Symmetry: D2
Subunit: 306 residues, 4 copies
């Protein structure tokens, strides 16, 4: 299930000091080509709402929004704070892996080294620099380029059964049905439907949700991802890889060996409906991370533009 | 009383974001000819400028590579050959590069389009139940234009200098830049560029000084130009003494305010190739009920 | 049954500008008397651990502890210099938590009904943190209180070693248990009630923990309120989550906080204290249950210590 | 080399907290004769001293009274109306105890605990020497030593408080230290903070700061103190090297308290001549933490 590093890796492909990995496949020419896909100006946000009500993998805590001062305060007391202008201010506490996200190459690995031989000792507490190598700031202008939706739900004409493993054949079959063709630097966005089952669940159902096996991609997608020179793979599930009822070889192979970024908890329902209606599954994607030095991932609001 | 109330209907919660139309996004995309990209964000960390008493953003790890050096058997999520690092942030949503929502500021008892201030509540009571930033989760992706006031003036701006309508129009003309409806205007004042070289005393003084920014007479012009948003590389956008513009932009016009953007590298590039118009991806995070958002604006040429 | 305010309240008892409520029952003489109960020097912490594993009423977040710098950092990088170059090595940490997220006192600013809080304080006085928080009845008003005499009433043992799910603890139960224990309450006492509920939480799996908060929970009922008033208690704490019985109106919250100005303690841990009291027969002790000094807050975490 | 490793056994994680015994708590309780109490905490808010780069504590509300003014129908969770709140803070961000896991030198902490035992919270935090090991400690006898009044005025900037000063102050007060005591030291430093403007507050931490010096450590050992707390930020004198931190936390297993507020207690003791008191200075029960906020209460 875990592909041997020596037979399948991108270490050294972009130099022995590179910290960007497969983001290097997104070059200026790939961005210009993506821009030519903005023909209609349609836009879609591929994020879930950042609030305390969304899926987040235990033991991670849900994002938590609080206000510092509100409109209600001025109803209560017109004389709040220091001028005729009235204002509201707020705060957030959240896991950076707590919502729609990119995971950096510093997020996961196996053994004592990360992508391109970076030692795990380089990934420290925040007060010691956090991810001092392979931090998400290395890709603060990346993931703006060409995106491609693969709608596995519509390809399967049904429910992915509980814990279904999405294969190479499934991905290629869906792209063929769509008459889509991948290019180097593409960000692949996979619709599994899993997040579309969350919000209707009651509290017991939401506990069960994470105890269940969960649909996602399998090990035989990893050579394909390498062959297609994708920069990142995102999905509308929580762990990208299929999760059983714990090896996680796809995480290890993508992040450490290929230097390919992982996107999770994206929201693809409205994008997928639009692509079904206009037949265009390739689009311009603005999926830049936040500029967070030493972080091992970021929340974002990916925008698909057609 | 100059205002846009009702312009887009009595139920509208998006304001001047409605100037960004699909056709205008298509036009902006045609500006992507080289593929050059520039992040207009400052780093999110505890060392950036933030208006007191706002807390600096604060990053912590939940588990790190160092933990596995210390204890190879670390199993945050159970026994696995896979090793992981996870992290967290606490920050003001007004604590870094930001958009301010229309729910961020007003005067009197009403916000944009007659929304009562009673609609803007604690997070447990819905936060901004109207005019929350989620209303523009697909906005601020379109055409951007830089106006470089430092370059126009030929020197660093005086402490507390009021940037006038004449300065904005004059600088755009010298650049041969033409604004279009729906544009996001990004203003280089230079103020934030001074921050990172400051020592702790300098950083305290930074917020005691008057601070350069736009003045009241820019508001009719911003209205006439049908801008969707105005952002700057200062902390408060408008000039601050040792806030009429906030009130008029957010409440009366429904025009968004961007603060603590980073424009130094973009400004050098635009001076070189002569192009101050670009495609801008400056979408907010999707945070329902929030009164603003962090972001990472990307200028694309 | 919500007890009518006019028949049962302490408004004005300690003046119409008072913000401390029943904490005023704890007097220097009552503290001196409580200190005389320190005869053996046995100590018991009545707190649950502050971590992300404890009971917290949804949608409140679990407390969350993170490190800023750790020993592991120096294993990975001996030269780690967080402050900076030094032979001394440091570890530092942070917490994010609800102040109602663990073992707690709830201030009189935490709960009320209608438009007024204890002693006629307008609800408009309780604002966002940036506008002063609880500008009246904040927990700082009792930064020196809740150190005095405590009395355990072990309702679990009184009822034979267990309480049914959702059981309503009555006046008669409280008096009956105190009589069995040969305990006598005095004005100013902090009453600590063992319901056993928190003793069932930690073995639950994620589904069980979700169910825990969806179903009825044992606690005190409405007819305990006049008794609490009678007895001139300063505060009432329990090892459940809501103090009063919760169904599958919450009049007790309203009557205690608003009408009487009596403080509510929740998610205390009483199992070891109760075992000790069963063995030595002493249910009255010195209690150090001071809140944190947090101006404008509507409650506080704490580590209550029973001293015998 | 002076140290307590092994004094309380190889498995011990409590250090000098073991000097506080039941009999010593009983003795301390007899000092409660007036029933007067004093909080020795500063307010937890964003306005207090906190050593950079630590951030100030930050209080926010989840729901407030104002919400029901704006919207009578607010239903966060009823006729009952509720206010709920949150705190984000460094555990070293206010009045505090520092655990034995907070500081050391070399690769070993108190009693030979490896520094590899002190990990991220997701990996157990301080898996040994966490503050939970003393969740019932620091309730016992406290003694104030008022160095400000002993010196007859405010201490000079960066003044090193010596063994002779501590002994001299105790002698002037007619105080007698006993084993198990918690020593509480008034330097006055925190009493200068709140009147400072933002520039002064920046300078405050760049300046040398008054505190105890190296020659106090053998005396702290000989006196069998459980912990030493002060109303400065770092306990030991800080220059522009921190041997006292290392010797106390790693070698002796003695706890360090910082940012205590002693103004009102010190005034009371000067008036009635009593500098010994019952102290309730328990930490919060935070497993794997390397310190804790608290509200220490002195009772006389």
């Amino acid at each position: 299930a875990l592909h041997p590093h020596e037979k399948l890796n991108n270490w050294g492909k972009w130099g022995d000091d590179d910290q960007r990995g497969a983001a290097n496949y997104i070059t200026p020419e790939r961005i210009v080509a993506a821009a030519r896909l903005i023909q209609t100006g349609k836009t879609f946000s591929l994020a879930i709402p950042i609030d305390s009500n969304g899926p987040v993998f235990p033991p991670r805590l849900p994002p938590h929004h609080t206000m510092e001062i509100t409109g209600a305060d001025y109803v209560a007391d017109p004389g709040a704070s220091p001028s005729p202008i009235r204002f509201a201010d707020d705060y957030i506490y959240m896991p950076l892996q707590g919502s729609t996200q990119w995971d950096a190459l510093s997020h996961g690995w196996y053994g004592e080294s990360l992508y391109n031989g970076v030692p795990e000792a380089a990934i420290r507490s925040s007060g010691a620099g956090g991810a001092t190598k392979l931090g998400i700031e290395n890709v603060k202008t990346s993931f703006l380029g060409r995106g491609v939706l693969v709608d596995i739900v519509r390809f399967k004409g049904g429910s992915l059964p509980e814990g279904y493993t999405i294969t190479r054949a499934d991905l290629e079959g869906a792209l063929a049905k769509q008459k889509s063709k991948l290019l180097p630097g593409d960000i692949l966005v996979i619709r599994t439907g899993l997040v579309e089952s969350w919000y209707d669940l009651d509290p017991v159902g939401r506990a069960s949700f994470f105890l269940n096996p969960m649909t996602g991609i399998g090990s035989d997608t990893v050579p394909w991802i390498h062959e297609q020179r994708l920069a990142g793979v995102a999905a509308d599930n929580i762990a990208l890889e299929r999760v059983p009822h714990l090896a996680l070889p796809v995480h290890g192979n993508l992040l450490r060996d290929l230097g390919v970024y992982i996107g999770e908890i994206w929201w693809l329902e409205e994008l997928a409906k639009d692509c079904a209606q206009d037949g265009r599954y390739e689009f311009f994607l603005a999926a830049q991370p936040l500029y967070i030095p030493g972080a091992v991932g970021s929340p974002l609001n990916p925008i698909a533009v057609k």
